[PDB]
Amino acid sequence: DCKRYLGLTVASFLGLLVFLTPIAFILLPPILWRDELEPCGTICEGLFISMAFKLLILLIGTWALFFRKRRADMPRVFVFRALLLVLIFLFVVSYWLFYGVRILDSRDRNYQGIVQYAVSLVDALLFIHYLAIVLLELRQLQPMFTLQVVRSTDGESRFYSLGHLSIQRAALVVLENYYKDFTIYNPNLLTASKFRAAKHMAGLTGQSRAMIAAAARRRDSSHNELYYEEAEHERRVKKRKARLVVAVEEAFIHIQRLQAEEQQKAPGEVMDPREAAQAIFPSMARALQKYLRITRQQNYHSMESILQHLAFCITNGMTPKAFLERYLSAGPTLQYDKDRWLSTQWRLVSDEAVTNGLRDGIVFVLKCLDFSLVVNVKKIPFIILSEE
Amino acid sequence: DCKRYLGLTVASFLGLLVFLTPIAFILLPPILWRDELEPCGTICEGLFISMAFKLLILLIGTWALFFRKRRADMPRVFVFRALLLVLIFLFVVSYWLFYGVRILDSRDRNYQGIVQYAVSLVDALLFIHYLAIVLLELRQLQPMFTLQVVRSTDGESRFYSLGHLSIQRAALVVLENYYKDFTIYNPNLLTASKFRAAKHMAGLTGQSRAMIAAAARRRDSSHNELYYEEAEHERRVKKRKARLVVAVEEAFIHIQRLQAEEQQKAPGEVMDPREAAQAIFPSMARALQKYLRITRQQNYHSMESILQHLAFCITNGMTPKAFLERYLSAGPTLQYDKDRWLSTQWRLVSDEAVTNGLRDGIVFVLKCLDFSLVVNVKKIPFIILSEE
Amino acid sequence: DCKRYLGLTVASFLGLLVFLTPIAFILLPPILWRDELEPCGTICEGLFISMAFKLLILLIGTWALFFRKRRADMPRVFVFRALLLVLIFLFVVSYWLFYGVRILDSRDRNYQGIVQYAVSLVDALLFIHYLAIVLLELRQLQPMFTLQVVRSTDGESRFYSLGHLSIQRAALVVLENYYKDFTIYNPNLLTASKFRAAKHMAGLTGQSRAMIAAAARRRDSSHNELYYEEAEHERRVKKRKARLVVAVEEAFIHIQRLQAEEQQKAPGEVMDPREAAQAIFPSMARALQKYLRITRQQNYHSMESILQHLAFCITNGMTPKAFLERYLSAGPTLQYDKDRWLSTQWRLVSDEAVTNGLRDGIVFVLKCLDFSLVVNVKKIPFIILSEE
Ligand SMILES: CC(C)CCC[C@@H](C)[C@H]1CC[C@H]2[C@@H]3CC=C4C[C@@H](OC(=O)CCC(=O)O)CC[C@]4(C)[C@H]3CC[C@]12C
Ligand SMILES: CC(C)CCC[C@@H](C)[C@H]1CC[C@H]2[C@@H]3CC=C4C[C@@H](OC(=O)CCC(=O)O)CC[C@]4(C)[C@H]3CC[C@]12C
Ligand SMILES: CC(C)CCC[C@@H](C)[C@H]1CC[C@H]2[C@@H]3CC=C4C[C@@H](OC(=O)CCC(=O)O)CC[C@]4(C)[C@H]3CC[C@]12C
Ligand SMILES: CC(C)CCC[C@@H](C)[C@H]1CC[C@H]2[C@@H]3CC=C4C[C@@H](OC(=O)CCC(=O)O)CC[C@]4(C)[C@H]3CC[C@]12C
Ligand SMILES: CC(C)CCC[C@@H](C)[C@H]1CC[C@H]2[C@@H]3CC=C4C[C@@H](OC(=O)CCC(=O)O)CC[C@]4(C)[C@H]3CC[C@]12C
Ligand SMILES: CC(C)CCC[C@@H](C)[C@H]1CC[C@H]2[C@@H]3CC=C4C[C@@H](OC(=O)CCC(=O)O)CC[C@]4(C)[C@H]3CC[C@]12C
């Protein structure tokens, strides 16, 4: 709690002082001298309301665009943010020094000559705001480069289009798209592949090349063990899927019967779905467990999670197919619980510095626990179009 | 017609008057007094052209961004639009009152002091324009939240990334992505599922739990009726697909033969594809009807629509595979006719008010005739990246 | 090289002169007259720093948004770019003429009256910059229209959402999405289809319609030759895929064994993957060639490309599944070599003028060597949402 307040005060007090700087500039001359005032006329009154409106617009824009919580942590310093911060710092301190030196040191600088200066601040500071969207959001709008992300474990391949962005920013975009695009990582397939491959190790340069070529030729004429076992596994998966579908349909029929029975007990008082899920889960529990075992998905789907999903479906009145399809096949990472995914162990590996922008032919790696994503960057070819 | 003009006049006259307000401000002093003019010099001439250029830029921007037809109707009031409208209203009326009170009430306010005021308007109003993109478009650029949309009927699941948006805006985005992303809703599958489930109803707490567990265990050892009938249906669908492919290939061969025959009749005079479609449709009509019956897609595909698609393919000279794949499997909603989809019966259900912004863990429902879409909102986890 | 420099000088000198125009405007009066200077005071000093900051912001924005290489060539003139260029040209020349006529022709226009003019330029020019994003990027942000792109050869269908854009811009967006979205074009399937269809040609109005209907009815009762041969082809493809998977697993086991053996030879000195790939390729070469022959993918995948991919996987330590899936099925165009795709022969065909904006119901064609993409444009329906 203390750290949050300490971080918030730094960003709040500086913003408050830079926003009230025009107010101080327009309220200091009246309080410094009283009998030396020159006739202001009307230009000051006309400029005051325009300055107030510009300040209100700046406040609204700052709240809309930049009053938000940080989403990700950058391994290195952010070039654009640091540039904007130092630009704002100099923009403020130079004006403060000018006001303190060229104005407060002499009995001069009439009020009518200060208000036009004051509106010169909000006119310029807003321009800095106009720069902020340029470096952050408007720079990446154009689809310049193409990023291909391939997983090292299961080989899932995805394609995205990005603009002129840093390596770290591109990696963060790839990571945020990974959760909602890539299939959940399953180490069971990796363990099965390792078990299959370990048999060759357990069993055990022109001449060596000839010998290995002859061995490969002999293997090509051997029995195709993989195909028949894959077909049998697919048949078993289909049979268990059909059994699970039938069980879920019967469970939903029982749910409808229970709701109908509870309707007569009390009108206008819907029952809580929790007890219905409690009573209905054992009916399909065996089928669901068998399907998870045959699909190697028991680790991700927990009993409490299944009950919560069933209760959510009961509240929404979803069809049995919607409930079935969640456990049917593996999907996005965000579907499962929060503890399933880790957003802290991610690392970036690249020969080039991450501060540099995207270039054609550069390749980087996003490492994480037991798995890595290789990202290839390519340049969009020069498309030439002609009217026939 | 009258309603359209009435709505257009309100948005046109106000824009015209707010755009011509600087013109009135710079043209009223010359017409009010003539012999009281002060020497303007050159600053007024320099400011006039800058004001004209700023007005031209504002006109171009207003035409580009905001001169467009409304796309969707908001069930509640739009906060950002109302805020912008009231801000513009006060920005105009306060300046009008200031001009009418502090200037027109006395023989003062020399011309050189008014032009600098006039350019203060277009400088500020454009800033309001700069605010309009901030609240409407620039606010949703950052991918803050993730929305998962699941259909209640068939369980189709999709994932999207949105920014800081209202519940109604997120629902509208989900709806507009539904047409081009989700598969067309097919009630035939629902009717088949209901017919299958009705058999159990027609046939008909620890002890009850034990009895239902024993019944489920006995059912698990029963015959798997679903798998074999699904396999037979898939085989029939594949056979009818092959027959339809052969029929379409023969029809395209006949189309090519007819075109070749018509070539000799008259050079440079291509035949209208309508009669070719008329003559060719009966050849593949039986196969197409059988495929639609076996795929439960006869309702969506009409005979006139099939003829129009065939004529379009003849004009474009598409391969038979392109024609086949449209009727092969169900696709997006926008493929079929306009009357197929309804954009009026949509409703929004959410415990929280739709005016509030997106928050983690909130869930809402988009209802429509016989089907609902459940949308879950999640927050992107804090991704921490480190350089190894 | 000469052409690049000639093109760069035109865009560089004009930018330099328009950026230094305020500097010339503020530095010419001091060098023209010396003894006629009026007391400047302090407003000039306050405006100078604001002008410098605005110039710096303009330079940063110009570098960020517009200092980039051209991506595509427009067959016709670009309306927005031409409008911006002519607007800038007039904005510069009119001010230059005004400065040369109304200032340099008389011993007038005191310095204090010029600086406020000078800041009037950077205030307006930046606004022109604010217009540039409006016409180019901010105009297409709103998802107005939907574009459906269907290939003429294989019938691949994709859907995209675009804004208020010209026909040329929409075609360019479709083309840039085609590489990363559509499957690579394979003429082998077209040749097979043509060979299958040529048999009917080689073998060879109410009465004609009856005869063709009877022929179609007789054909519907004939043998389904396509289904059985497709099933046999699928079985052969699956068997060869399993054999290739086994061969790749054995090759990766050999790679791991070679790496382990080389580890003892020298610590901290990793071997180059080129020789390992050279020694390992013959082991899986026969299986890979057989799979390419059965999948008609031998043309795209070359031996050098396979060796490079194997070396890349060895460097990244990818699983055999990742290596297998690249050659498993045809994917995006960008995966293969640069020479595979052509971005010069693209042509645009449309009855309406390409300079006009997108409208509902308009259809255009993107032609290229042996294949065309038909794009249909539709308007998003008016969605009406109500709170229950
Ligand atoms: C008058 C005002 C606008 C001056 C503002 C200061 C900038 C000129 C400074 C502030 C932050 C600096 C950046 C901070 C960090 C880096 C990372 C740094 O990366 C490396 O040293 C490794 C990559 C390499 O080898 O080049 C390269 C310079 C750069 C972009 C700096 C470039 C110069 C910047 C933009
Ligand atoms: C007479 C006065 C007005 C001249 C002012 C010079 C500026 C136009 C220069 C000086 C320092 C430059 C900056 C120095 C370092 C950086 C970091 C640099 O970062 C990178 O290379 C990584 C980001 C990317 O990929 O663009 C990008 C250019 C930038 C912002 C430069 C932009 C142009 C700046 C502001
Ligand atoms: C000096 C100028 C800029 C003043 C402009 C007026 C605004 C302060 C007003 C105009 C429209 C108002 C909004 C109109 C409608 C609503 C919906 C309203 O929703 C509810 O009452 C239900 C949700 C809840 O329980 O909070 C909440 C306030 C809000 C956002 C209002 C907040 C205050 C707003 C932005
Ligand atoms: C001394 C003067 C300059 C103070 C001016 C105060 C403003 C900075 C305040 C006063 C009224 C506020 C508004 C009152 C109500 C609304 C509606 C409110 O709407 C919502 O909560 C839903 C939209 C969303 O999710 O952000 C968002 C904040 C906003 C625009 C507020 C933004 C900040 C405003 C303009
Ligand atoms: C005071 C300043 C802002 C004037 C700037 C000049 C514009 C009014 C000009 C410059 C470029 C012109 C465009 C250049 C090319 C074309 C394509 C041209 O296309 C055709 O002639 C075929 C389509 C048809 O049949 O209308 C239509 C006019 C247009 C958009 C022109 C419209 C008028 C433009 C925008
Ligand atoms: C008293 C003074 C300030 C009046 C100035 C009139 C402008 C508001 C007009 C005059 C010329 C017009 C332009 C003439 C031609 C074109 C090209 C035209 O191009 C198209 O139709 C294709 C692009 C699209 O789909 O919008 C779009 C409108 C535009 C920019 C027009 C925008 C509005 C302009 C600048």
Side-chain angles (χ1 to χ4, degrees):
Chain A
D1 297 10
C2 60
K3 186 135 175 199
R4 305 282 207 277
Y5 282 124
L6 189 151
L8 188 153
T9 50
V10 186
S12 185
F13 283 139
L14 274 297
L16 189 148
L17 66 92
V18 302
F19 288 154
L20 283 184
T21 306
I23 310 297
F25 282 170
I26 67 171
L27 284 183
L28 273 175
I31 208 169
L32 283 155
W33 52 83
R34 186 76 267 170
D35 50 325
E36 285 92 5
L37 267 299
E38 293 87 5
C40 297
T42 316
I43 45 176
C44 71
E45 193 73 27
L47 284 185
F48 279 158
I49 173 174
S50 67
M51 204 196 66
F53 283 161
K54 287 171 189 180
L55 277 171
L56 181 55
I57 295 161
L58 177 53
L59 282 179
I60 294 174
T62 315
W63 159 84
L65 281 168
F66 302 117
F67 175 65
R68 59 185 54 182
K69 291 168 68 176
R70 186 154 53 96
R71 190 172 57 88
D73 200 285
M74 284 294 185
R76 289 219 169 274
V77 64
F78 200 80
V79 173
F80 288 139
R81 183 176 179 178
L83 176 67
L84 283 172
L85 260 68
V86 300
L87 182 57
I88 292 166
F89 190 76
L90 63 94
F91 178 84
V92 167
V93 300
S94 181
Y95 290 168
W96 266 109
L97 285 173
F98 178 72
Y99 196 87
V101 163
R102 283 284 197 179
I103 296 188
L104 307 183
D105 283 357
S106 62
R107 307 281 97 177
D108 281 324
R109 320 290 99 81
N110 49 354
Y111 203 77
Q112 68 101 27
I114 304 178
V115 298
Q116 198 175 285
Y117 183 74
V119 308
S120 295
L121 192 145
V122 290
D123 276 337
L125 194 59
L126 277 164
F127 283 159
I128 309 181
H129 191 266
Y130 169 69
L131 200 65
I133 57 175
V134 165
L135 301 172
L136 293 176
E137 302 178 321
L138 301 180
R139 188 180 166 90
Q140 64 189 27
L141 279 187
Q142 185 166 354
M144 197 63 58
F145 307 101
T146 305
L147 266 65
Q148 163 193 0
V149 192
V150 64
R151 199 140 59 177
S152 173
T153 49
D154 63 327
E156 200 72 75
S157 181
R158 280 307 186 103
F159 270 71
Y160 311 107
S161 183
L162 279 77
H164 283 280
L165 288 183
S166 298
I167 307 187
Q168 41 194 15
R169 285 166 104 194
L172 283 192
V173 171
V174 162
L175 287 189
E176 67 181 1
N177 296 329
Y178 158 82
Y179 296 132
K180 59 186 274 303
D181 277 310
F182 283 77
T183 304
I184 192 66
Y185 162 66
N186 219 340
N188 295 157
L189 300 158
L190 298 197
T191 55
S193 177
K194 284 180 271 179
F195 284 163
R196 199 193 301 122
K199 306 176 66 181
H200 184 249
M201 290 203 234
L204 279 75
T205 183
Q207 193 67 41
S208 179
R209 294 181 69 248
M211 286 192 287
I212 65 185
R217 281 188 168 271
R218 286 189 276 107
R219 187 259 313 278
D220 287 331
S221 66
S222 288
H223 194 232
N224 196 0
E225 196 196 49
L226 190 50
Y227 173 63
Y228 302 114
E229 69 194 3
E230 280 179 353
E232 292 293 326
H233 179 246
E234 289 291 327
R235 289 176 64 251
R236 286 149 199 180
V237 166
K238 289 182 187 294
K239 289 182 181 179
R240 294 184 163 208
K241 170 185 70 68
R243 293 186 185 275
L244 179 59
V245 164
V246 173
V248 165
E249 286 182 352
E250 181 191 317
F252 268 76
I253 291 167
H254 288 156
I255 290 179
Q256 295 183 350
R257 182 191 59 85
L258 276 174
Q259 193 180 4
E261 283 186 344
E262 282 288 328
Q263 279 182 333
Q264 294 92 20
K265 288 181 69 65
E269 292 179 354
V270 67
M271 74 183 158
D272 62 358
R274 195 71 180 88
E275 60 98 17
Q278 295 297 109
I280 289 305
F281 175 71
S283 66
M284 78 165 84
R286 188 175 185 270
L288 196 58
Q289 284 181 1
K290 287 188 63 181
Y291 190 71
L292 291 189
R293 287 204 300 112
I294 204 66
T295 46
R296 279 92 167 93
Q297 214 172 5
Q298 54 195 355
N299 199 1
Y300 304 141
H301 295 301
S302 191
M303 183 278 288
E304 193 70 89
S305 171
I306 295 160
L307 289 176
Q308 282 182 0
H309 186 39
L310 193 56
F312 187 62
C313 290
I314 290 181
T315 61
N316 307 314
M318 316 194 72
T319 47
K321 294 179 288 293
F323 181 83
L324 279 153
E325 270 156 355
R326 182 173 179 176
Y327 315 96
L328 183 66
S329 66
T333 309
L334 291 175
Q335 270 179 0
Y336 308 106
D337 48 352
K338 271 78 67 177
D339 205 6
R340 176 67 35 193
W341 61 74
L342 279 81
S343 49
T344 308
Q345 317 274 7
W346 284 106
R347 296 160 296 162
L348 191 48
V349 178
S350 72
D351 301 8
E352 203 180 349
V354 306
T355 57
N356 300 148
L358 285 150
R359 198 178 65 244
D360 196 359
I362 73 170
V363 180
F364 53 95
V365 184
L366 277 153
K367 294 282 183 67
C368 179
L369 290 176
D370 190 74
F371 76 101
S372 49
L373 301 165
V374 177
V375 190
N376 292 319
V377 186
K378 304 174 185 300
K379 180 59 180 299
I380 283 187
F382 197 89
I383 305 176
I384 293 184
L385 199 68
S386 65
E387 204 175 23
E388 304 143 7
Chain B
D1 297 10
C2 60
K3 186 135 175 199
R4 305 282 207 277
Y5 282 124
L6 189 151
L8 188 153
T9 50
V10 186
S12 185
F13 283 139
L14 274 296
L16 189 148
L17 66 92
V18 302
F19 288 154
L20 283 185
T21 306
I23 310 297
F25 282 170
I26 67 171
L27 284 183
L28 274 175
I31 208 169
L32 283 155
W33 52 83
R34 186 76 267 170
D35 50 325
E36 285 92 5
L37 267 298
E38 294 87 4
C40 296
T42 316
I43 45 176
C44 71
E45 193 72 27
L47 284 185
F48 279 158
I49 173 174
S50 67
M51 204 196 66
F53 283 162
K54 287 171 189 180
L55 277 171
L56 182 55
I57 295 161
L58 177 53
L59 281 179
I60 294 175
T62 315
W63 159 83
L65 281 168
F66 302 117
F67 175 66
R68 59 185 54 182
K69 291 168 68 176
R70 186 154 53 97
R71 190 172 57 87
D73 201 285
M74 287 294 185
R76 288 219 169 273
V77 64
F78 200 80
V79 173
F80 288 139
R81 183 176 179 178
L83 176 67
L84 283 172
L85 260 68
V86 300
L87 183 57
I88 292 166
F89 190 76
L90 63 94
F91 178 84
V92 167
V93 300
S94 179
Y95 292 168
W96 266 109
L97 284 173
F98 178 72
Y99 196 87
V101 163
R102 283 283 197 179
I103 296 188
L104 307 183
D105 283 357
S106 62
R107 307 281 97 177
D108 281 324
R109 320 290 99 81
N110 49 354
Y111 203 76
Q112 68 101 27
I114 304 178
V115 298
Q116 198 174 285
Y117 183 74
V119 308
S120 295
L121 192 145
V122 290
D123 276 337
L125 195 59
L126 277 165
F127 283 158
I128 309 181
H129 190 266
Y130 169 69
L131 200 65
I133 56 175
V134 165
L135 301 172
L136 293 177
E137 302 178 321
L138 301 180
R139 188 180 166 90
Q140 64 189 27
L141 279 187
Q142 185 166 353
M144 197 63 58
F145 307 101
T146 305
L147 266 65
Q148 163 193 359
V149 192
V150 64
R151 199 140 59 177
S152 173
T153 49
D154 63 327
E156 200 72 75
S157 181
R158 280 307 186 103
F159 270 71
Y160 311 107
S161 183
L162 279 77
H164 283 281
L165 288 183
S166 298
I167 307 187
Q168 59 184 357
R169 285 166 104 195
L172 282 192
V173 171
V174 162
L175 287 189
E176 67 181 1
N177 296 329
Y178 158 82
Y179 296 132
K180 59 186 274 303
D181 277 310
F182 283 77
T183 304
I184 192 66
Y185 162 66
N186 219 340
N188 295 157
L189 300 158
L190 298 197
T191 54
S193 177
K194 284 180 271 178
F195 284 163
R196 199 193 301 121
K199 306 176 66 181
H200 184 249
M201 290 203 234
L204 279 75
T205 183
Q207 193 67 41
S208 179
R209 294 181 68 248
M211 286 192 287
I212 65 185
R217 280 188 168 271
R218 286 189 276 107
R219 187 259 313 278
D220 287 331
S221 66
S222 288
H223 194 232
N224 196 0
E225 196 196 49
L226 190 50
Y227 172 63
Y228 302 114
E229 69 194 3
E230 280 179 353
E232 293 293 326
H233 179 246
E234 289 291 327
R235 289 175 64 251
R236 286 149 199 180
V237 166
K238 289 182 187 294
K239 289 181 181 179
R240 295 184 163 208
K241 171 185 70 68
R243 293 186 185 275
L244 179 59
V245 164
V246 173
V248 165
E249 286 182 352
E250 182 191 317
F252 268 76
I253 292 166
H254 288 156
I255 290 179
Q256 295 183 350
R257 182 191 59 85
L258 276 174
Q259 193 180 4
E261 283 186 344
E262 282 289 328
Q263 279 182 333
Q264 294 92 20
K265 288 181 69 65
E269 292 179 354
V270 67
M271 74 183 158
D272 62 358
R274 195 71 180 88
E275 60 98 17
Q278 295 297 109
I280 289 305
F281 175 71
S283 66
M284 78 165 84
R286 188 176 185 270
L288 196 58
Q289 284 181 0
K290 287 188 63 181
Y291 190 71
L292 291 189
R293 287 204 300 112
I294 204 66
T295 46
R296 279 92 167 93
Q297 214 172 5
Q298 54 195 355
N299 199 1
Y300 304 141
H301 295 301
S302 191
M303 183 278 288
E304 193 70 89
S305 171
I306 295 160
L307 289 176
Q308 282 182 0
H309 186 39
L310 193 56
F312 187 62
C313 290
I314 290 181
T315 61
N316 307 314
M318 316 194 72
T319 47
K321 294 179 288 293
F323 181 83
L324 279 153
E325 270 156 355
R326 182 172 179 176
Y327 315 96
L328 183 66
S329 66
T333 309
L334 291 175
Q335 270 179 0
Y336 308 106
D337 48 352
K338 271 78 67 177
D339 205 6
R340 176 67 35 193
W341 61 75
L342 279 81
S343 49
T344 308
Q345 317 274 7
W346 284 106
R347 296 160 297 162
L348 191 48
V349 178
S350 72
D351 301 8
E352 203 180 350
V354 306
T355 57
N356 300 148
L358 285 150
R359 198 178 65 244
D360 196 359
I362 73 170
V363 180
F364 53 95
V365 184
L366 277 153
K367 294 282 183 67
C368 179
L369 290 176
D370 190 74
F371 76 101
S372 49
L373 301 165
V374 177
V375 190
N376 292 318
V377 187
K378 304 174 185 300
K379 180 59 181 299
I380 283 187
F382 197 89
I383 305 176
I384 293 184
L385 199 68
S386 65
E387 204 175 23
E388 304 143 7
Chain C
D1 297 10
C2 60
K3 187 135 175 199
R4 305 282 207 277
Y5 282 124
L6 189 151
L8 188 152
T9 50
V10 186
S12 185
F13 283 139
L14 274 297
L16 189 148
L17 66 92
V18 302
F19 288 154
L20 283 185
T21 306
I23 310 297
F25 282 170
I26 67 171
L27 284 183
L28 274 175
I31 208 169
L32 283 155
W33 52 83
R34 186 76 267 170
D35 50 325
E36 285 92 5
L37 268 298
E38 293 87 4
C40 296
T42 316
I43 45 175
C44 71
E45 193 73 27
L47 284 185
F48 280 159
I49 173 174
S50 67
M51 204 196 66
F53 283 161
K54 287 171 189 180
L55 277 171
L56 181 55
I57 295 161
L58 177 53
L59 282 179
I60 294 174
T62 315
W63 159 84
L65 281 168
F66 302 117
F67 175 65
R68 59 185 54 182
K69 291 168 68 176
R70 186 154 52 97
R71 191 172 58 88
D73 200 285
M74 286 294 187
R76 291 216 170 274
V77 64
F78 200 80
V79 173
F80 287 139
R81 183 176 179 178
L83 176 67
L84 283 172
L85 260 68
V86 300
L87 183 57
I88 292 166
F89 190 76
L90 63 94
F91 178 84
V92 167
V93 300
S94 179
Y95 292 168
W96 266 109
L97 284 173
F98 178 72
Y99 196 87
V101 163
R102 283 284 197 179
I103 296 188
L104 307 183
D105 283 357
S106 62
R107 307 281 97 177
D108 281 324
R109 320 290 99 81
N110 49 354
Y111 203 76
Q112 69 101 27
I114 304 178
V115 298
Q116 198 175 285
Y117 183 74
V119 308
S120 295
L121 192 145
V122 290
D123 276 337
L125 195 59
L126 277 164
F127 282 159
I128 309 181
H129 190 266
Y130 169 69
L131 200 65
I133 57 175
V134 165
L135 301 172
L136 293 177
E137 302 178 321
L138 301 180
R139 188 180 166 90
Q140 64 189 27
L141 280 187
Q142 185 166 354
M144 197 63 58
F145 307 101
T146 305
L147 266 65
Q148 163 193 359
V149 192
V150 64
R151 199 141 59 177
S152 173
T153 49
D154 63 327
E156 200 72 75
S157 181
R158 280 307 186 103
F159 271 71
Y160 311 106
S161 183
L162 279 77
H164 283 281
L165 288 183
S166 298
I167 308 187
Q168 287 182 171
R169 286 164 106 194
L172 283 191
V173 171
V174 162
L175 287 189
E176 66 183 1
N177 296 329
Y178 158 82
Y179 296 133
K180 58 186 274 303
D181 277 310
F182 283 77
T183 304
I184 192 66
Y185 162 66
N186 219 340
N188 295 157
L189 300 158
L190 298 197
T191 55
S193 177
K194 284 180 271 179
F195 284 163
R196 199 193 301 121
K199 306 176 66 181
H200 184 249
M201 290 203 234
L204 279 75
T205 183
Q207 193 67 41
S208 179
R209 294 181 69 248
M211 286 192 287
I212 65 185
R217 280 188 168 271
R218 286 189 276 107
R219 187 259 313 278
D220 287 331
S221 66
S222 288
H223 194 232
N224 196 0
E225 196 196 49
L226 190 50
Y227 173 63
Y228 302 114
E229 69 194 3
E230 280 179 354
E232 292 293 326
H233 179 246
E234 289 291 327
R235 289 175 64 251
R236 286 149 199 180
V237 166
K238 289 182 187 294
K239 289 181 181 179
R240 294 184 163 208
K241 170 185 70 68
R243 293 186 185 274
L244 179 59
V245 164
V246 173
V248 165
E249 286 182 353
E250 181 191 317
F252 269 76
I253 292 166
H254 288 156
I255 290 179
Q256 295 183 350
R257 182 191 59 85
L258 276 174
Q259 193 180 4
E261 282 186 344
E262 282 289 328
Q263 279 182 333
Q264 294 92 20
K265 288 181 69 65
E269 292 179 354
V270 67
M271 74 183 158
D272 60 357
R274 193 71 181 88
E275 61 98 17
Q278 280 276 327
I280 289 305
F281 175 71
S283 66
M284 78 165 84
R286 188 175 185 270
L288 196 58
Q289 284 181 0
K290 287 188 63 181
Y291 190 71
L292 291 189
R293 287 204 300 112
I294 204 66
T295 46
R296 279 92 167 93
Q297 214 172 5
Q298 54 195 355
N299 199 1
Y300 304 141
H301 295 301
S302 191
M303 188 249 286
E304 193 71 89
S305 171
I306 295 159
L307 289 177
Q308 282 182 0
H309 186 39
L310 193 56
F312 187 62
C313 290
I314 290 181
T315 61
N316 307 314
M318 315 194 72
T319 47
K321 294 179 288 293
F323 181 83
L324 279 153
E325 270 156 355
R326 182 173 179 176
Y327 315 96
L328 183 66
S329 66
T333 309
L334 291 175
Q335 270 179 0
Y336 308 106
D337 48 352
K338 271 78 68 177
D339 205 7
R340 176 67 35 193
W341 61 74
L342 279 81
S343 49
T344 308
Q345 317 274 7
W346 284 106
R347 295 160 296 162
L348 191 50
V349 178
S350 72
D351 301 8
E352 203 182 349
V354 300
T355 56
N356 301 148
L358 285 150
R359 198 178 65 243
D360 196 359
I362 73 170
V363 180
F364 53 95
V365 184
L366 277 153
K367 294 282 183 67
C368 179
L369 290 176
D370 190 74
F371 76 101
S372 49
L373 301 165
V374 177
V375 190
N376 292 318
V377 186
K378 304 174 185 300
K379 180 59 180 299
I380 283 187
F382 197 89
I383 305 176
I384 293 184
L385 199 68
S386 65
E387 204 175 23
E388 304 143 7

